[PDB]
Amino acid sequence: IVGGRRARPHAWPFMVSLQLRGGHFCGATLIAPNFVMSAAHCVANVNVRAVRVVLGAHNLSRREPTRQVFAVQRIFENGYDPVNLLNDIVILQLNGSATINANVQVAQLPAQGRRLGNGVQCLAMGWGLLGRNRGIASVLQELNVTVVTSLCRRSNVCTLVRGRQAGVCFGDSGSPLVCNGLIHGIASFVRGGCASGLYPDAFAPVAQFVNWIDSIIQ
Amino acid sequence: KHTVPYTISVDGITALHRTYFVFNKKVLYQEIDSKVKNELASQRGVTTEKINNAQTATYTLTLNDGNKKVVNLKKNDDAKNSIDPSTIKQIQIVVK
Ligand SMILES: *[C@@H]1O[C@H](CO[C@H]2O[C@@H](C)[C@@H](O)[C@@H](O)[C@@H]2O)[C@@H](O[C@@H]2O[C@H](CO)[C@@H](O[C@@H]3O[C@H](CO)[C@@H](O)[C@H](O)[C@@H]3O)[C@H](O)[C@H]2NC(C)=O)[C@H](O)[C@H]1NC(C)=O
Ligand SMILES: *[C@@H]1O[C@H](CO[C@H]2O[C@@H](C)[C@@H](O)[C@@H](O)[C@@H]2O)[C@@H](O[C@@H]2O[C@H](CO)[C@@H](O[C@@H]3O[C@H](CO)[C@@H](O)[C@H](O)[C@@H]3O)[C@H](O)[C@H]2NC(C)=O)[C@H](O)[C@H]1NC(C)=O
């Protein structure tokens, strides 16, 4: 997240870190005790058995007893197209069920088909780069953004910070976009580099996939 | 064991996952080309034809000294040349 602020510790207990070799590479969202939701491009051709699903984290540079760690048992997808990053969403079944507590909770999703208009105020978050050509954050970051439709495909939810250069950046893929308490987006891609102040950030539109998500997580 | 972050932009679109190449002990540029082209195909479905029909298709090494080397994915005259992988800071792969 470029141009954001540190989140309060465990402010967003559904926030997940996906790690390979002890390094964060993508975010995810806890949507059931044994399921997380992320971007399909995060796991499309990786060593899945090595992925660690880290719940209850806040500061990736500290040892944290609040954490619960799981493995990926199964990958569910729905028409992912890597050429154009369409339907960039995956549901990952865990090898166990999280214990719900103060630091680990499931997110709430919108109703199928619900579309957000221009100007809706949302919050983006993640452990991605703090600047361009940067390194991963230590502390979870958050960022006030606004939904926009200009330069956005109907198959995406797009957001912008008006008046300054701020936005999601590498390592933020897979992280939730929260809008009035509900997860409406999964961070997917940027155009013109991170925090261009020109192109909006693009998220996979969670509300278009809710019936499918529900059929998997019950 | 040196790790080098890289990004891929195709038709302006850049996926946001944090990705590294893992390699002191020099390698041929060809070894880097193979990995770059394979990940272009693996991550964004970019084919040999897409590369050949793009206006531009390159990857740029940003070195730790601050210099930048542009490698053409169409033509790599430096394929058989060598480079110290530990001198590389990041790689920007760009097809459009
Ligand atoms: C769901 O998966 C997690 C993730 O662990 C993965 O790690 C690989 C290597 C594989 O062996 C398998 O365990 C998982 O795919 C499991 O968490 C791990 O569980 C094991 C054993 O329960 C732990 O091993 C222990 O580690 C310490 C040293 O760190 C040893 O001294 C112990 O003797 C013991 O071997 C390991 O610490 C756990 N890893 C993490 C990151 O927590 C989890 O058990 C599993 N859950 C279910 C229900 O299957
Ligand atoms: C930057 O974002 C935060 C949080 O945004 C998230 O939370 C909600 C409110 C919404 O924006 C949503 O899309 C995201 O889920 C904003 O913090 C919130 O600000 C309001 C007041 O401005 C807080 O007060 C609450 O709202 C009503 C009126 O709206 C008040 O009467 C009550 O006092 C009530 O407490 C609200 O608690 C905050 N929400 C959280 C989670 O902290 C923040 O305002 C925004 N910054 C700017 C400049 O817009």
Number of structural domains chain A divides into: 2
Alpha-carbon gap, residue A172 to A1, rounded angstroms = 7
Give the C-alpha separation, A66 to A210, whole Å. 29
C-alpha A177/C-alpha A35 separation (Å) is 18
> Cβ contacts (< 8 Å) between A26 and chain B: which residues?
17-18
Contact A121, A107 (CB under 8 A): no
- Give CA separation, B58 vs A204, B14, B55, in Å: 28, 15, 10
Cβ-Cβ contacts under 8 Å, A190 against chain B:
14, 16
Residue-range definition of the domain harbouring residue A124: 1-12+107-207
Question: Residues A121, A138: one domain?
Answer: yes
Residues 16-45 of chain B whose Cβ lies under 8 A from any Cβ of chain A: 16-20, 42-45
Give dist(CA A49, CA A67) in Å, integer.
19
Phi/psi at B41 (5° precision): -75, -40
Domain ranges of chain B: 1-96
Q: What three-state secondary structure class fits B44?
A: helix
CA A104 from chain centre, in angstroms, equals 15
Residue for token digits 């925090």? Answer: A195
Question: Which alpha helices (H) appear in chain A, and where do they start and end?
Answer: 40-43, 210-217
Same domain? For A96 and A155 the reply is no
A120 shares its domain with A38: no
Length of chain A: 218
Preceding-residue numbers of gaps in chain B (C–N over 2.5 Å): 23
CB burial of A113-125 (b: ≥16 within 10 Å; e: otherwise) equals eeebeeebebbbb
Q: What are phi and psi of A37, to 5 degrees?
A: -120, 130
CB atoms near residue B21 (< 10 Å): 17
Question: Any residues with CB less than 8 A from the CB of A83 and at least 6 apart, and which?
Answer: B44, B45, B46
Resolution (A): 1.9
Pair of tokens at residue B39:
């990940």
Which residue type, as a one-letter code, is found at position A125?
A: M
Q: What's the DSSP call for residue B42? A: H
The preferred substitution site among A51, A67, A69 for testing ligand 1, maximizing ligand atoms within 8 Å of CB, is A69
Cβ(A9)–Cβ(A137) below 8 Å: no
Cβ neighbour number for residue A104 with a 10 Å cutoff: 21
The answer, yes or no, to whether any atom of ligand 1 lies below 6 A from the CB of A95, is: yes
CATH number at residue A152: 2.40.10.10
Q: Which residues of A are designated catalytic?
A: 41, 88, 173
Whether residue A76 sits in one domain with residue A128: no
Method: X-ray
Backbone φ and ψ for A142, nearest 5 degrees, come out as -135, 160
Q: Do A188 and B62 touch (CB under 8 A)?
A: no
Asked if residue A92 and residue A46 are part of one domain, the reply reads yes
| Residue A80 and residue A5 share a domain | no
A171/B15 Cβ within 8 A:
no
Mutate to test the pocket of ligand 1, among A51, A63, A70, A73 (most ligand atoms within 8 A of CB): A70
Contact flag B43-A188 (C-beta cutoff 8 Å): no
CATH number of B1-96: 3.10.20.120
Same domain, A28 and A136: no
Same structural domain, A202 and A118: yes
A170 and A114, same domain (yes or no): yes
* A70 strand-pairing partners: A53
| Amino acid type, A16 | V
